[PDB]
Structure 1
């Protein structure tokens, strides 16, 4: 279980929800794991997924790394959510804040995540604040771009199966940022 703190229903019926929790605990169909080109597992999100999902989660990431090869910037790739509430883990390689097209690329990252979720006909996806870990995006900037990407994705993709997008954030500040940004959508 968890408590949705805020819901924004988009006009095309997707539920965006902010949840303050450990994202690894969220039984979303997919959870997004912001990683790097080499599918490094660490940082807030990777640590928590690893903590939750343990060896089977890591084995699945390593396999995915081996199969996928290096994840391009803004690239996403999925692994099974072994050891985790989430059915799949969508690993993404966010750009670094300051990269020439960091903003566009962060959007692309998000869209790639959504696309991979839709490719597996998933109904729900949980995002942490992609890019605002070591990748250095201000949380608000990240939030605004992510939400922008989400909005764009759903108005561009009529066959999308994703009904719920979670923003799962551990800290109050992030929560506040996301509920502010998410409210600016329709």
Structure 2
């Protein structure tokens, strides 16, 4: 519908490629999209509302059933459901931490990203699209969040034998967040 622009692309040491893209996360054709959420797996805010709108009411049944079987999504943890009417096959729901005046806030965000990627590997996901995580309701400053997330991804790929994940897209809707991710990608290797 709206289309996309690729503002930056960078390949990491062992060949995974990260992209900073302007567009609508729910329009990307990829294996998985990331849904930052809370312990009750709500679809709230700009990103969560858009995901639910595009996925359709069918996702509600699946998320509600997931909680019947698995209880709430604990902080830093991830869970996968189908994407329903989304053009991506899976939704990776992640419970990101809130920012706090402690180094533990960035550690927890690192673990959230590591857990999301690890779970995505279990499905042999090849391409995965992230919104800007941690900025917004979780209140991380934008640069700190982007640094933490990009470094967690770089470190993930250097901490496993191999991964199915070949491409990671940061799909951002505002110039401010594009500028932040573009700047931090330069320091991501």
Alignment coverage as a number of residue pairs: 186
Moved beyond 4 Å, runs of 4+: none
Does the residue aligned with 2:57 lie in a helix, a strand or coil?
helix
Residue from 151, 156, 165 that aligns with 1:153:
156
Task: State which structure, 1 or 2, has the greater radius of gyration over its C-alpha atoms.
Answer: 2
Q: 1:98 is matched with which residue? A: 100
Counting only pairs closer than 5 Å after superposition, residues 1-80 of structure 1 correspond to structure 2 as 2-80=4-82
- Partners in 2 of 1:19 and 1:162 — Cα distance? 18
Post-superposition offset of 1:45: 1.4
Post-superposition offset of 1:106: 0.3
Post-superposition offset of 1:63: 2.2
- Partners in 1 of 2:174 and 2:138 — Cα distance? 18
CA RMSD of the aligned region, Å? Answer: 1.3
- Partners in 2 of 1:19 and 1:4 — Cα distance? 5
Q: Is the 8 A contact 1:44 1:133 kept in 2?
A: no
Post-superposition offset of 1:32: 0.5
Does the residue aligned with 2:150 lie in a helix, a strand or coil?
helix
Q: TM-score, normalised by structure 1?
A: 0.95
- Partners in 2 of 1:99 and 1:69 — Cα distance? 29
Structure 1: gaps of 5 or more residues: none
Does the residue aligned with 2:56 lie in a helix, a strand or coil?
helix
Question: Over residues 121-153 of structure 1, what are the superposed CA-to-partner deviations in whole Å (9 max), with x where a residue is unaligned?
Answer: 100111111111201111111100000100110
Structure 2: gaps of 5 or more residues: none
Q: 2:175 is matched with which residue? A: 172
Post-superposition offset of 1:185: 1.0
Inter-CA distance 159–57: structure 2 relative to 1 (3 Å threshold): same
Q: TM-score, normalised by structure 2?
A: 0.94
- Partners in 1 of 2:101 and 2:81 — Cα distance? 27
Post-superposition offset of 1:155: 0.5
- Partners in 2 of 1:63 and 1:85 — Cα distance? 22
Question: Over residues 20-55 of structure 1, what are the superposed CA-to-partner deviations in whole Å (9 max), with x where a residue is unaligned?
Answer: 111111112111000001101111211110111111
